[PDB]
Amino acid sequence: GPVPFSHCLPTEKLQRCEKIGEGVFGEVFQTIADHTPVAIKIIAIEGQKTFEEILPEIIISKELSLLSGEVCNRTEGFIGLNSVHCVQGSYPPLLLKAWDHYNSTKGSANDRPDFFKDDQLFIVLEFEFGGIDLEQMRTKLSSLATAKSILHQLTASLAVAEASLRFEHRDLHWGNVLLKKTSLKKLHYTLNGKSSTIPSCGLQVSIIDYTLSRLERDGIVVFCDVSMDEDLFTGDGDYQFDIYRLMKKENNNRWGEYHPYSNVLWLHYLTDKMLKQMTFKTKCNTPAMKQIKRKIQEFHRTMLNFSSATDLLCQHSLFK
Ligand SMILES: Cc1cn(C)nc1Nc1ccc2scc(-c3ccncc3)c2n1
Numbered sequence: 001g002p003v004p005f006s007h008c009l010p011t012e013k014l015q016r017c018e019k020i021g022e023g024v025f026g027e028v029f030q031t032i033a034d035h036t037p038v039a040i041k042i043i044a045i046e047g048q049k050t051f052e053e054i055l056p057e058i059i060i061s062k063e064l065s066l067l068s069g070e071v072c073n074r075t076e077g078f079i080g081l082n083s084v085h086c087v088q089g090s091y092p093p094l095l096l097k098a099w100d101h102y103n104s105t106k107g108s109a110n111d112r113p114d115f116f117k118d119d120q121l122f123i124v125l126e127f128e129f130g131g132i133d134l135e136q137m138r139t140k141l142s143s144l145a146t147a148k149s150i151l152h153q154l155t156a157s158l159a160v161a162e163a164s165l166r167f168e169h170r171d172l173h174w175g176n177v178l179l180k181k182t183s184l185k186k187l188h189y190t191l192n193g194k195s196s197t198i199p200s201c202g203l204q205v206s207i208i209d210y211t212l213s214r215l216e217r218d219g220i221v222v223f224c225d226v227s228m229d230e231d232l233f234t235g236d237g238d239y240q241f242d243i244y245r246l247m248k249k250e251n252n253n254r255w256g257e258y259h260p261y262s263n264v265l266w267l268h269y270l271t272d273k274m275l276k277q278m279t280f281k282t283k284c285n286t287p288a289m290k291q292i293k294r295k296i297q298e299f300h301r302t303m304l305n306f307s308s309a310t311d312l313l314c315q316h317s318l319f320k
């Protein structure tokens with residue numbers, strides 16, 4: 001059967017819940033469990049999305065989480081999934097209070113979740129805490145060396161997911177790139193059996209929000225069908241909203257197919273943001289840093305001629 005909210009969110013864990021984010025159908029809370037930070041996503045089911053509409057996110061979250069402990073195709077560059085629960089009950093008042101605090105400070109585009117009755121079902125996905133998004137870190141990164149590390153981590157992570165699962169993220173905006181301190185000097189990945197390293201520059205990247213993502217295992221495709229969605233393809237003001245139109249154009253509005261080019265489009269959007277909307281604490285006023293800047297500029301202007309993240313990682317001069 002379903003379980004009460006208290007099964008997932010015992011008193012002390014619930015007391016420490018703060019809202020950190022949201023989606024069109026979701027609320028994300030940060031908390032502590034057994035002295036360990038976690039990120040909780042809570043999605044209402046039936047009644048808003050159906051179970052069938054939520055399952056893809058569950059499967060994808062699961063498959064990408066598994067890549068951290070595989071061998072031939074291995075990456076930590078997406079986020080650990082600790083557990084999945086189907087919960088029944090009205091929204092916990094302590095969660096409402098945390099919800100309100102976020103509405104008062106940042107503003108929510110969601111409905112205050114106070115209208116749910118005690119037979120309401122929810123899917124509660126509990127993840128490792130991945131850190132703070134790249135947008136919030138717009139002014140806080142240290143140098144363009146860091147920016148290069150970040151792009152290399154993203155590119156590799158997508159490459160491995162391409163090789164393993166024929167993955168497309170399909171919404172990798174700078175809000176979905178998390179950063180977290182690591183004392184590791186070098187990060188490791190393995191692509192089709194070949195291991196390599198990336199200088200961390202003190203950070204570990206984690207990719208999130210598989211809400212539009214696509215993959216497959218054994219000829220079964222798991223995805224979000226947005227072919228009858230109109231609103232997604234009629235935004236602007238940011239280069240983000242062009243990617244949605246480019247994907248739709250590249251794939252002829254058939255979202256089951258595999259088009260890893262879409263990973264390249266999103267990495268280009270992120271390289272653009274690195275070059276145009278970030279301010280680094282150290283400026284590129286040394287020969288070595290100017291050089292790094294030039295190579296990122298050269299990546300920006302050439303990467304769109306690569307067919308996938310795999311192609312970029314193996315072949316692009318930025319990573320050699
Ligand atoms: C929870 C989660 C996991 N996946 C695969 N996707 C998710 N979705 C979102 C949506 C919004 C935000 S705003 C901060 C987060 C976040 C922060 C830290 N650690 C994970 C997620 C977030 N996550």
Ligand code: NI
Pocket residue numbers: 007085
């Ligand atoms: Ni349980």
